[PDB]
Amino acid sequence: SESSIENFLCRSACVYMGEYHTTNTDTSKLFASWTINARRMVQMRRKLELFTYVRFDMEVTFVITSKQDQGTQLGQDMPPLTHQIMYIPPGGPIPKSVTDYTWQTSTNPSIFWTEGNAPPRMSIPFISIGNAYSNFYDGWSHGVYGYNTLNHMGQIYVRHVNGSSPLPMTSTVRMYFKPKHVKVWVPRPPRLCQYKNASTVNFTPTNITEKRQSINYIPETV
Amino acid sequence: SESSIENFLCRSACVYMGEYHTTNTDTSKLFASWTINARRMVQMRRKLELFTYVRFDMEVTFVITSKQDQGTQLGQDMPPLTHQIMYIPPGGPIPKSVTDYTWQTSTNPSIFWTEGNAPPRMSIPFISIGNAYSNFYDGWSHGVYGYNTLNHMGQIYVRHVNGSSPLPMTSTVRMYFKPKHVKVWVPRPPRLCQYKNASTVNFTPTNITEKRQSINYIPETV
Amino acid sequence: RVRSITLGNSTITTQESANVVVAYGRWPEYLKDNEATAEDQPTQPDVATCRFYTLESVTWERDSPGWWWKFPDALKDMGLFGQNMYYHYLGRAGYTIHVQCNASKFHQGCLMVVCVPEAEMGCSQVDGTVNEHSLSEGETAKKFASTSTNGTNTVQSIVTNAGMGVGVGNLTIFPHQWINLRTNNCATIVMPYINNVPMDNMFRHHNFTLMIIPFVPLDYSSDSSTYVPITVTVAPMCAEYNGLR
Amino acid sequence: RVRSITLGNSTITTQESANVVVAYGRWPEYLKDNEATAEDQPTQPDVATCRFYTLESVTWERDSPGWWWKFPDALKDMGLFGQNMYYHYLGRAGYTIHVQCNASKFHQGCLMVVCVPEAEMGCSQVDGTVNEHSLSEGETAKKFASTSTNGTNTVQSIVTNAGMGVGVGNLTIFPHQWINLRTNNCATIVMPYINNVPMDNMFRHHNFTLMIIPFVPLDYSSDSSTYVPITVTVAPMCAEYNGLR
Amino acid sequence: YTSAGNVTCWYQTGIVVPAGTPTSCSIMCFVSACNDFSVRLLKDTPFI
Amino acid sequence: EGKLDTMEIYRIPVQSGNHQSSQVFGFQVQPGLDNVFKHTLLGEILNYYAHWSGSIKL
């Protein structure tokens, strides 16, 4: 009952933590971004690799905390801060500044949230023109080995929702991810070697198991 | 199913962001105002121009954030701030100061809200003595070309609700707008040129499409 | 107690006491009619795709780490089934694989024969990428190694990790068969079409991989033959392509 | 009053007012089952043999004697139907041939379009023999001449004797169609398989010959186009080969 | 470098006219969708 | 080139004389992405969605 597929896979986890400012002199530090896949979380990756094909919905919750920068200026009286969390489907426009037009496109779903309230949450369906996702692909992208374009799942972007000339602030977002209504096909053996990077199956050769003293050795009984 | 009219148009968007103070020496910076139309949001404008006549209800949500001005005075202990959000129907009195009598007229619907709570929200019906709104008008106002008075939808005004001699504060409001229960008539071709201003259809001539190498050219197959 | 089987203009002979593994319980079949009714009409050859194709034999000696083949494109030069790979943009098929040995009662050894879907392989250099030639050579087998390999763009083919980063004793999770020279010398595996889409292009994707791996090495004594031959025979089943009209 | 016809992944457009000649009253069909029951089992492709193949157009000018093609081997490079010619030892098929013109109401001329079985041709030298290249060039047409030819190993191709030693006004004995620029511009001929054995090898025998011959030459005046294009489209019907298993 | 089908047009015969008609001419193409067309994942357009 | 702003962009030229094996035109069928199909009524719709499929009529 605890070994069913749902109870084994449907569990929440922190998969990305990022920081972003209201004012900066880099302009890439003004927003945070994440590409959705399940290959940079080493514990979820291994449980997912026991199968060849998967199908699930996604649920994402966001925990967001702010701070005034230790730069100099005190005595402030500020209202609570507002944030915008945008999801981009596969085949959507990507922003490059925080002032871009794509933060207003009608087909990118978006959430507006102010601090002090309950943590925000959105639910994404199975988004693929194929019939399942694949954890393993023995092919070419059209050319990269092992990468097929049916596994695109979208992106998430987060910014502040101030007006003009805002006050300096630093925020941190943590994303909690959970698959739901899961189905799996074609079981596989468990990964025996350590993972080396996030896109390949590359590995250094590993021992089959650890040694004992002799082929007869059994430890003394208590 | 995702190409139905409701799923294509009924989506929320930020259409106005404004700033206002509690004390100032301009007296127009003491309140914020917006006239409701759908011609200064370039992404919603284009999706709306695929039709000649539209009918919808409006839903408006407000995200409001405050700050103490960096002027000088620290050590304050302040209760949370209260705000007033007033809607004026077509044919209503317009305020010109924040102390005006029109902020108290019984027929201008109004919302009172204090920070820390959930974001406020009001719902406006289809308000027109005509039977639909029009995105295009080939006529005269009675004289402005292209402007007919049946498209008036009202206005929104926001101020602080303090007493006498308040402390200095700066607030920002963001308005999120969403049409509901939508119906459209007479489809049109999509806008090919860039928009130039918010009241006309003026444009500079544009190419029909981009070039290729020759009328036979097809790219080499992978 | 010998059966003689004819497919087309091919004939082979097997023993009626054979044992057959149907991969996941599923026999091959046509995608029925109406996944994509209107402008996706398929066709089927059924001419000289249903016929036995026999590769070259491999030679099992005292130190043989193992062999592997990729499917398809182990059949890209095999008569009509290979012609159809060039004429058509999409296809699909199941297969029947026979593996046989020729040995005496004075030999000994043990083989695993396994069919692995999506057998994505690792590079010999951890920050490298695999080459197209090092993954397959068509109807010629690639070889596993008994120690860890080097060189650029090569599959890391140490046989204990099977090129996939797992323990090779755990490949029994896939459709597999054992050949113990003491008790049998043959193995039949029937594989259906397994993908996450109904059809696909047959040149830049390897549906599955056939592997043959000795777990107990070949042993003989005084004047027996010093090698044992292994033979692989493949019959495509229910092949189907996009219509051309 | 236009029909659109799709065979496989091909589509062409004709007029519904077409006229169709079925060669001797006989539609094409499979040799039914049991001429050679036991060890003569056939197979049929029915994949991308039933599809429209379109050759290059020819150019009809003021002095054009005519054109001819040999069947098969006008299709030995045409996709799958040509692959099957190399993989199989015996075959058979019928055909549908469409011939079309593109002309205006200010042009004039008249064409005969005829399909001739066993069109054995004579040499330009009476005590000579014909070459294999001078009989056909595949999907490129051979040309008739307006006077008598010379040179070794060449077909004697004076157009009044049609290379066969008969009077060209008498070729109406064969399945034929007239194209008079005044009244129509198209012709369809459906040919069945005609031989004195049920199957045959498709490389050293020409079943039939398609000929196109102007009887009234093309004429135009001041600034009309100086040529008229002719287009030929072929669809094989009920093709069938020896089984390979 | 597309992986898409293509369409081409060829001169089978050439154009033939009487005396007193224009020499050159034109063809026009129209495109449309058939009833079985489907779309998914509303996004933002890249043109404004 | 030279005619992206005229009505001539819509006209496939058929020339006079005898050219009875030459190409007239050719294109890949890629609505949404390819320049010749991109700004039509079908192309403009498809560019609002990230996945689409069906049949096309020419």
CSV table of N, CA and C in Angstrom, one decimal, chain D residues 57 104 106-107 221 224-225 227-231, chain E residues 11-21 23:
chain,number,residue,atom,x,y,z
D,57,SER,N,7.9,16.8,-68.6
D,57,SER,CA,7.1,17.2,-69.8
D,57,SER,C,8.0,17.2,-71.0
D,104,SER,N,-3.8,27.0,-75.8
D,104,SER,CA,-4.8,28.1,-75.8
D,104,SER,C,-5.8,27.8,-76.9
D,106,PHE,N,-6.0,29.8,-79.4
D,106,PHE,CA,-5.4,30.3,-80.6
D,106,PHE,C,-4.3,29.4,-81.2
D,107,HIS,N,-4.1,28.2,-80.6
D,107,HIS,CA,-3.3,27.2,-81.1
D,107,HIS,C,-4.1,26.2,-81.8
D,221,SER,N,0.3,31.9,-84.4
D,221,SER,CA,0.6,33.1,-85.1
D,221,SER,C,1.1,34.2,-84.1
D,224,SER,N,1.8,34.4,-79.8
D,224,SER,CA,1.6,33.3,-79.0
D,224,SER,C,2.9,32.6,-78.6
D,225,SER,N,2.8,31.7,-77.6
D,225,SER,CA,4.0,30.9,-77.2
D,225,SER,C,4.3,30.0,-78.4
D,227,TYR,N,5.7,27.0,-78.3
D,227,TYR,CA,5.7,25.5,-78.0
D,227,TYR,C,4.5,25.2,-77.2
D,228,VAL,N,4.2,23.9,-77.0
D,228,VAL,CA,3.1,23.4,-76.2
D,228,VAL,C,3.6,22.3,-75.3
D,229,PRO,N,3.4,22.3,-74.0
D,229,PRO,CA,3.9,21.2,-73.2
D,229,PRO,C,2.9,20.1,-73.0
D,230,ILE,N,3.5,18.9,-73.1
D,230,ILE,CA,2.7,17.6,-72.9
D,230,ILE,C,3.2,16.9,-71.6
D,231,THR,N,2.3,16.4,-70.8
D,231,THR,CA,2.6,15.8,-69.5
D,231,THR,C,2.0,14.4,-69.4
E,11,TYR,N,6.6,23.0,-65.6
E,11,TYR,CA,6.0,23.1,-66.9
E,11,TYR,C,6.0,21.8,-67.6
E,12,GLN,N,4.8,21.2,-67.8
E,12,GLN,CA,4.7,20.0,-68.6
E,12,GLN,C,4.8,20.4,-70.1
E,13,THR,N,4.1,21.4,-70.6
E,13,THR,CA,4.1,21.7,-72.0
E,13,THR,C,4.5,23.1,-72.4
E,14,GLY,N,4.1,24.1,-71.6
E,14,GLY,CA,4.3,25.4,-72.2
E,14,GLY,C,3.0,26.0,-72.5
E,15,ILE,N,2.9,27.4,-72.6
E,15,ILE,CA,1.6,28.0,-72.8
E,15,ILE,C,1.5,28.4,-74.3
E,16,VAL,N,0.3,28.2,-74.9
E,16,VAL,CA,0.1,28.3,-76.3
E,16,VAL,C,-1.1,29.3,-76.5
E,17,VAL,N,-1.0,30.3,-77.3
E,17,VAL,CA,-2.0,31.3,-77.5
E,17,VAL,C,-2.2,31.5,-79.0
E,18,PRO,N,-3.4,32.1,-79.3
E,18,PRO,CA,-3.6,32.6,-80.7
E,18,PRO,C,-3.1,33.9,-80.9
E,19,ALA,N,-3.3,34.5,-82.1
E,19,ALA,CA,-2.8,35.8,-82.4
E,19,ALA,C,-3.7,36.9,-81.8
E,20,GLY,N,-3.1,37.8,-81.0
E,20,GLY,CA,-3.8,38.9,-80.4
E,20,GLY,C,-4.1,38.8,-79.0
E,21,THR,N,-3.5,37.9,-78.3
E,21,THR,CA,-3.7,37.7,-76.8
E,21,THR,C,-2.4,38.0,-76.1
E,23,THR,N,0.9,37.7,-73.7
E,23,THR,CA,1.8,36.6,-73.8
E,23,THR,C,2.1,36.0,-72.4
